[PDB]
């Protein structure tokens, strides 16, 4: 496989970027030069979010006032406006406002045995962008991922129906998958393997 070996410094820097997340907000969806975007104001901060992939046809044009956003600034720039990719999901329904789901979370480092950790899911519609960032954040902070040459491995998200979502730790998550979302009520097990 002829894939660019991402520097662990690059992966550390990207996955340490501050996150802007808000639930039940308004975004205005539009198409600009054949590409789909959603604009959101959070605390007088402007974000333009690319809807590339599946999320492209999930939102209606114009006002979407039932959304949750997980915003990460792409690039290193002086521009005030945030440019983020995916992480736009449907907000929880009223019966599910206080919703908590605790899937199994295990983190395995090298040849060591997996270590269980408490992980809480609050969303019915959760993006791979959010799960990817938050699981890599835990692996970085507690198990030294992207330090001392620890740059390889996998994230495995297993659903109640047996379907699995795998994320390669040696690369950033695929831009197309940042807009993909799964049923948070259906996440059973999570494994973060580092090598």
Residues near Cl ion (CB under 5 A) are 165, 174-176
Q: What is the dihedral of CA 154, 86, 19, 150, to 10 degrees?
A: 20
Residue 182: CB minimum distance to Cl ion, A: 8
For Cl ion, the closer of residues 40 and 131 by Cβ is 131
Residue 25: CB minimum distance to Cl ion, A: 25
Going by their DSSP bridges, the two strands 104-109 and 187-194 should be labelled as parallel
For Cl ion, the closer of residues 22 and 165 by Cβ is 165
For the chain, report the end-to-end CA distance as a whole number of angstroms. Answer: 19
Residue 163: CB minimum distance to Cl ion, A: 9
Residue 166: CB minimum distance to Cl ion, A: 7
For Cl ion, the closer of residues 38 and 143 by Cβ is 38
> What is the rounded CA–CA span in Å between residue 176 and residue 50?
10
Nearest to 169 by CA among 152, 148, 190: 152
**Burial track 106-144 (b if 16+ CB lie within 10 A, e otherwise):** bbbbeeeeeeeeebebebbbbbbbbbbbbbbebbbeebe
For Cl ion, the closer of residues 105 and 167 by Cβ is 167
For Cl ion, the closer of residues 143 and 158 by Cβ is 158
> What is the rounded CA–CA span in Å between residue 68 and residue 49?
12
Residues in the chain: 195
> What is the rounded CA–CA span in Å between residue 6 and residue 9?
8
Residue 14: CB minimum distance to Cl ion, A: 12
For Cl ion, the closer of residues 138 and 165 by Cβ is 165
Residue 153: CB minimum distance to Cl ion, A: 17
């Amino acid at each position: 496989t002829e894939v660019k070996q991402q520097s662990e410094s690059e992966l550390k820097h990207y996955y340490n970027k501050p996150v802007l997340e808000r639930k039940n907000v308004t975004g205005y969806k539009y198409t600009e030069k054949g590409k789909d975007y959603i604009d959101v104001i959070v605390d007088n901060q402007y974000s333009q979010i690319s809807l590339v992939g599946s999320d492209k046809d999930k939102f209606k044009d114009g006002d979407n006032s039932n959304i949750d956003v997980f915003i990460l600034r792409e690039g290193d720039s002086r521009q005030a406006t945030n440019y983020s990719i995916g992480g736009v999901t449907k907000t929880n329904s009223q019966p599910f406002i206080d919703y908590i789901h605790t899937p199994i979370l295990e983190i395995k480092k090298g040849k060591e045995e997996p270590q269980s950790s408490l992980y809480q899911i609050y969303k019915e519609d959760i993006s791979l962008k959010e799960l990817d960032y938050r699981l890599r954040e835990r692996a970085i902070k507690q198990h030294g991922l992207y330090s001392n040459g620890l740059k390889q491995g996998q994230i495995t998200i297993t659903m109640k129906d047996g379907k699995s979502h795998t994320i390669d730790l040696s690369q950033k998550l695929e831009k197309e998958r940042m807009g993909d979302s799964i049923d948070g009520r259906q996440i059973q097990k999570i494994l973060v393997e580092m090598k």
